[PDB]
């Protein structure tokens, strides 16, 4: 999708950094100390991504053909593609754990 470049309030991915120190999570998160989570922002006029999913494509096909109530639904900037990310943190029994947590970083933003 698109990255936010200001002025234009279209659905774009605005960068955002999360510091575990800030939210008080560094006491149980050994690495990393923070990461680029990002989020989606922007108005959606009349599925508005670049590479959607099968479901969004089928419904979008019904939208671009006039079949309602799809022409009576909201469109909102939401994450379309989500990336995993590695983390080294502490278990509930103070055990060092490494996991490839899913749905960690927003990569693409589209309109629902």
């Amino acid at each position: 999708g698109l990255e936010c470049d200001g002025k234009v309030n279209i659905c774009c991915k605005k960068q955002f950094f999360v510091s575990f120190k800030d939210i008080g999570w560094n006491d149980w998160i050994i690495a990393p100390s923070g990461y680029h989570a990002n989020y989606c922002e922007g108005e959606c006029p009349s599925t508005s991504g670049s590479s959607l999913s099968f479901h969004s494509t089928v419904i979008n096909h019904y939208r671009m053909r006039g079949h309602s109530p799809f022409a009576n639904l909201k469109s909102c900037c939401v994450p379309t593609k989500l990336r995993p990310m590695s983390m080294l943190y502490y278990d509930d029994g103070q055990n060092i754990i490494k996991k490839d947590i899913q749905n960690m970083i927003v990569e693409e933003c589209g309109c629902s």
Partner: protein, 94 residues
């Protein structure tokens, strides 16, 4: 053609392998890394874990696995390159 040294000190509890070579898998156009985490009680090093690490900029362009943080309780390490976690070092950035 990308792999990292694998070691899990908690092999018994987790009921997984203790050593071996882990192949690194990552999305296209996304980098791959190796990581190493150990303890350094008064000079005697005790490795905790070693293996593959997902795409992380903090690991970009680093053929050496070094811990640049100042005196942590658990030392961490990440790098780019096959078996780059084979060895690790400590060089705090002041």
């Amino acid at each position: 053609t990308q792999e990292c040294l694998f070691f899990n000190a908690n092999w018994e509890k987790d009921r997984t392998n203790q050593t071996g070579v882990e192949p690194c898998y990552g999305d296209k156009d996304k980098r791959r890394h190796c990581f190493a985490t150990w303890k350094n009680i008064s000079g005697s090093i005790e490795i905790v874990k070693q293996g593959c690490w997902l795409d992380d900029i903090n690991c970009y362009d680093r053929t050496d696995c070094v811990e640049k943080k100042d005196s942590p309780e658990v030392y961490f390490c990440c790098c780019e390159g096959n078996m780059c976690n084979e060895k690790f070092s400590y060089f705090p950035e002041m």
